[PDB]
Design an enzyme around this catalytic site. Structure first.
Site, PDB file in Angstrom:
ATOM      1  N   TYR A 159      70.223  75.205  84.076  1.00 25.72           N
ATOM      2  CA  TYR A 159      68.855  74.851  84.430  1.00 25.72           C
ATOM      3  C   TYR A 159      67.855  75.911  83.987  1.00 25.72           C
ATOM      4  O   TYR A 159      66.801  76.071  84.611  1.00 25.72           O
ATOM      5  CB  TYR A 159      68.751  74.616  85.936  1.00 25.72           C
ATOM      6  N   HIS A 165      73.915  78.197  95.833  1.00 29.56           N
ATOM      7  CA  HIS A 165      73.740  77.189  96.867  1.00 29.56           C
ATOM      8  C   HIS A 165      72.749  77.618  97.935  1.00 29.56           C
ATOM      9  O   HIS A 165      72.141  76.757  98.579  1.00 29.56           O
ATOM     10  CB  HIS A 165      75.093  76.852  97.487  1.00 29.56           C
ATOM     11  N   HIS A 172      78.089  70.356  85.548  1.00 29.02           N
ATOM     12  CA  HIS A 172      77.976  70.502  86.992  1.00 29.02           C
ATOM     13  C   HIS A 172      79.236  71.114  87.592  1.00 29.02           C
ATOM     14  O   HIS A 172      79.152  71.935  88.511  1.00 29.02           O
ATOM     15  CB  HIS A 172      77.665  69.146  87.623  1.00 29.02           C
ATOM     16  N   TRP A 226      80.760  73.277 101.043  1.00 27.37           N
ATOM     17  CA  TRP A 226      80.815  73.281  99.585  1.00 27.37           C
ATOM     18  C   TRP A 226      82.155  73.799  99.087  1.00 27.37           C
ATOM     19  O   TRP A 226      82.667  73.327  98.066  1.00 27.37           O
ATOM     20  CB  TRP A 226      79.675  74.116  99.017  1.00 27.37           C
ATOM     21  N   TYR A 243      62.765  63.329  85.712  1.00 29.64           N
ATOM     22  CA  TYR A 243      63.701  63.502  86.817  1.00 29.64           C
ATOM     23  C   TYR A 243      63.581  64.898  87.409  1.00 29.64           C
ATOM     24  O   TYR A 243      63.421  65.057  88.624  1.00 29.64           O
ATOM     25  CB  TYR A 243      65.131  63.242  86.346  1.00 29.64           C
TER      26      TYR A 243
HETATM   27  N1  LIG Z   1      69.810  66.407  91.212  1.00 23.75           N
HETATM   28  C1  LIG Z   1      70.407  67.395  92.093  1.00 23.75           C
HETATM   29  N2  LIG Z   1      69.931  67.495  93.344  1.00 23.75           N
HETATM   30  C2  LIG Z   1      70.505  68.419  94.126  1.00 23.75           C
HETATM   31  C3  LIG Z   1      70.051  68.555  95.419  1.00 23.75           C
HETATM   32  C4  LIG Z   1      70.620  69.500  96.258  1.00 23.75           C
HETATM   33  C5  LIG Z   1      71.651  70.309  95.786  1.00 23.75           C
HETATM   34  C6  LIG Z   1      72.219  71.254  96.620  1.00 23.75           C
HETATM   35  C7  LIG Z   1      73.239  72.046  96.137  1.00 23.75           C
HETATM   36  O1  LIG Z   1      73.803  72.998  96.992  1.00 23.75           O
HETATM   37  C8  LIG Z   1      73.713  71.932  94.844  1.00 23.75           C
HETATM   38  C9  LIG Z   1      73.148  70.988  94.005  1.00 23.75           C
HETATM   39  C10 LIG Z   1      72.117  70.175  94.472  1.00 23.75           C
HETATM   40  C11 LIG Z   1      71.525  69.218  93.662  1.00 23.75           C
HETATM   41  N3  LIG Z   1      71.966  69.102  92.443  1.00 23.75           N
HETATM   42  C12 LIG Z   1      71.440  68.216  91.650  1.00 23.75           C
HETATM   43  C13 LIG Z   1      71.995  68.133  90.227  1.00 23.75           C
HETATM   44  C14 LIG Z   1      72.402  66.709  89.871  1.00 23.75           C
HETATM   45  C15 LIG Z   1      71.706  66.004  88.716  1.00 23.75           C
HETATM   46  C16 LIG Z   1      72.043  64.776  88.400  1.00 23.75           C
HETATM   47  C17 LIG Z   1      73.134  64.064  89.191  1.00 23.75           C
HETATM   48  C18 LIG Z   1      73.736  64.674  90.187  1.00 23.75           C
HETATM   49  C19 LIG Z   1      73.341  66.097  90.554  1.00 23.75           C
END
Ligand SMILES: Nc1nc2ccc3cc(O)ccc3c2nc1Cc1ccccc1
Ligand code: NA
Length: 192
Positions: A187, A19, A172, A89, A135
């Site tokens: 990832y 994070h 996730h 979190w 994406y």
């Molecule tokens: N796209 C993301 N965007 C972020 C943006 C900031 C984040 C900060 C964090 O501390 C942890 C995760 C994220 C984050 N995680 C995802 C992954 C995701 C993909 C598809 C649907 C929902 C989530």
């Protein structure tokens, strides 16, 4: 009696640095502070514009990103530093794991629903590798094409090599909430 222990490891540096990596990503100007305003503008409204999401999809996506990071204690007009971010979190994850165990809707799943909806051309709720690559680059979660390909080798796919929301949501849970070793490498090399 009815109690079950929840998988967490909030004191492990590997979860903290996951994070922290994303916080720095959100911390564009690198001043150690972020706001829900910036998150919803960057992580939502600007992603949906590049994806050409419909107005309703853009709205629904904003509602879900808004609610997700409010579960972390962030509110509009409030600057947030990483210590508070990570404590939120912990609360978010603990809350989400209880909802999941009780089959109540979770913020992570609804967020996933809003994203998959944007890529739901035929209504079957599939994301292709090509769609994910777009994406990952627009959201910045996975700009490397190699990482996106690693994500699909990592995940369980359907007969067309495609991905659905239940799979990605379960990944996730392990990657962002519980530090399940099964989610390691979700990832590729893009996120520790
Ligand atoms: N796209 C993301 N965007 C972020 C943006 C900031 C984040 C900060 C964090 O501390 C942890 C995760 C994220 C984050 N995680 C995802 C992954 C995701 C993909 C598809 C649907 C929902 C989530
Ligand atoms: Na900042």
């Amino acid at each position: 009696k009815y109690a079950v222990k929840l998988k967490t490891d909030f004191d492990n540096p590997r979860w903290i640095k996951r994070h922290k990596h994303m916080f720095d990503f959100l911390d564009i100007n690198g001043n150690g502070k972020i706001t829900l305003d910036e998150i919803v503008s960057k992580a939502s409204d600007d992603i949906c514009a590049k994806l050409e999401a419909t107005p309703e999809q853009t709205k629904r996506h904003q509602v879900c990103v808004e609610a997700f990071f409010r579960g972390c204690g962030m509110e509009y007009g409030k600057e947030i530093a990483f210590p508070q971010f990570l404590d939120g979190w912990k609360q978010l994850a603990t809350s989400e794991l209880k909802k999941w165990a009780r089959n109540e809707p979770t913020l992570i799943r609804e967020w996933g629903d809003a994203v998959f909806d944007i890529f739901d051309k035929d209504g079957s709720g599939t994301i292709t590798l090509d769609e994910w690559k777009a994406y990952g680059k627009i959201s910045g979660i996975s700009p490397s094409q190699e990482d996106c390909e690693a994500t699909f080798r990592h995940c369980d796919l359907d007969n067309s090599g495609d991905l659905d929301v239940d799979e990605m949501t379960r990944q996730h849970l392990g990657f962002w909430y519980t530090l399940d070793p099964e989610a390691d490498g979700l990832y590729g090399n893009g996120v520790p």
